[PDB]
Amino acid sequence: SNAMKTIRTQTPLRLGLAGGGTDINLYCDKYTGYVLNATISLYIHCTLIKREDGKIIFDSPDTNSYCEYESKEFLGNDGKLDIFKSIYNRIVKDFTKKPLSFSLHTYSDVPSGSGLGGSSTLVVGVIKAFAEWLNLPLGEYEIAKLAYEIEREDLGIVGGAQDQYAATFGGFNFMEFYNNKRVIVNPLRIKNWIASELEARTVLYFTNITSLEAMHAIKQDAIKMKEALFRADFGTLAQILGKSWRNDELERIYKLAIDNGAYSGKTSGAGAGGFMFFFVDPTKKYNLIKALRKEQGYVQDFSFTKEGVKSWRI
């Protein structure tokens, strides 16, 4: 039937829906913030193929990067796909203890610099390919953690492994922070129609153009959003999501969207050439999209996904 020497993984990107931060500790319990994100149907795809010629190949055509090295236990940096070397180097140090021969191929559904957690989604996607291929004893949590440490070695990170949790666990996740280091992830069960209604009121547009009283009400905003989520209260949810969102080329298109129905708008990234996310009445969604198609950027349809990284062998 199948040769079974090929592994593939598919890892979704995510949208920050809301968030509050108090990097400065003050609460009686050391609460430093919250984020509500949700994975969407835009992915990073990886394919890993076993080889037998003692070669290692890293192929990432969406970044115009291709590498071929001789198989060995440690790959030194050469400024090309160094993130792949760190991952490989770690897998060998911690689990296999010997070199491997294979080809790794990857691409993203969105151009580089989109701000949907692409760097972490990739790392997670690639680690899962190795884990599935090598039968490594690593649960979803251990994967997100390993992804965080690898990213930490090559660059500095704040907010803990939140992006890695989104990519690994998927769905809507409500994250609570303590001492700007500890992260408590609440993977939420959201009724399907809630996601469906949110999708019906949403437009995602890529632009293609690369105080203290507020801080102290953050915890209560969180309780209110969570409360609105389990009650499936859209009035409130829409009321607080719109709030959480309260000169450039971005401001012109924001104006253009509101003049065509959008009642709320938000950017993120890389807050410039990334994307704009709008809320609109579904009976107005089509006209809005038609207007935006006329501009420089493009509208990207998507749905919220229920799961995180998946993998399979063929």
Residue 193 binds which of Ca ion, its own copies, none (CB < 5-8 A, kind-dependent): its own copies
Binding string to its own copies for residues 183 to 222, with x set by CB under 8 A, is what? ---------xx--xx--x----------------------
> Site for Ca ion (CB under 5 A): which residue of 9, 10, 37, 86?
86
Query: What sign results for the dihedral spanned by CA atoms 59, 64, 69, 71?
Result: negative
60 annotated as ligand-binding = yes
Paired residues of 265 in beta bridges: 278
Asked if 285 is part of the footprint of its own copies (rule: CB under 8 A), the reply reads: yes
Asked if 140 is part of the footprint of its own copies (rule: CB under 8 A), the reply reads: no
Strands laid side by side in the 264-268 sheet = 264-268, 275-279, 202-206, 298-300
Buried-exposed string 80-104: b where 16+ CB fall within 10 A, e elsewhere: ebbbbbbbbbbbbeeeeeeebebbb
Residue with tokens 């410039």: 272
Choose the binding region for its own copies from 78-86, 205-213, 228-236, 244-252 (rule: CB under 8 A). 228-236
Q: How far apart are CA 279 and CA 62, in angstroms?
A: 30
Asked if 295 is part of the footprint of its own copies (rule: CB under 8 A), the reply reads: no
Choose the binding region for its own copies from 14-22, 42-50, 218-226, 239-247 (rule: CB under 8 A). 42-50
Q: Which is nearer to Ca ion, 76 or 235 (CB)?
A: 76
Query: What sign results for the dihedral spanned by CA atoms 154, 158, 163, 169?
Result: positive
Find, among 134, 159, 138, 137, the residue nearest to 148 by Cα: 159
> Site for its own copies (CB under 8 A): which residue of 61, 113, 139, 271?
61
Q: How far apart are CA 135 and CA 129, in angstroms?
A: 10
Half-sphere exposure for 99 (CA within 13 Å, toward CB): 14
Question: Does 163 qualify as catalytic in the annotation?
Answer: yes
Backbone angles phi, psi at 106, to 5 degrees: -150, 150
For the bound state, the minimum distance from the C-beta of residue 85 to its own copies, rounded and expressed in Å, comes to 20
Half-sphere exposure for 202 (CA within 13 Å, toward CB): 22
Binding to its own copies, residues 64-123 (CB under 8 A):
103, 105, 107, 109
Run of H or E including 34: strand 31-50
For the bound state, the minimum distance from the C-beta of residue 136 to Ca ion, rounded and expressed in Å, comes to 19
Residue 303 binds which of its own copies, Ca ion, none (CB < 5-8 A, kind-dependent): its own copies
Choose the binding region for its own copies from 80-88, 90-98, 269-277, 284-292 (rule: CB under 8 A). 284-292
Residue 86 binds which of its own copies, Ca ion, none (CB < 5-8 A, kind-dependent): Ca ion
For the bound state, the minimum distance from the C-beta of residue 67 to Ca ion, rounded and expressed in Å, comes to 15
Quote the distance between the C-alpha of residue 233 and its chain's center.
26
Q: How far apart are CA 130 and CA 197, in angstroms?
A: 37
Q: Which is the catalytic residue, given 82, 94, 163, 248?
A: 163
- Spell out the residues 6+ positions from residue 261 whose beta carbon is closer than 8 angstroms to its own: 280, 281, 284, 285, 287, 288
Choose the binding region for its own copies from 113-121, 150-158, 229-237, 268-276 (rule: CB under 8 A). 229-237
Asked if 45 is part of the footprint of its own copies (rule: CB under 8 A), the reply reads: yes
Q: Which is nearer to its own copies, 82 or 233 (CB)?
A: 233
For the annotated catalytic residues, the residue numbers are 163
Binding site for substrate, by residue number, is 20-23
What does the binding site for its own copies look like in residue numbers (CB under 8 A)?
A: 1-3, 8, 10, 41, 45, 47, 49, 59, 61-62, 103, 105, 107, 109, 192-193, 196-197, 200, 231-236, 282-283, 285-287, 290, 301, 303, 310, 312, 314
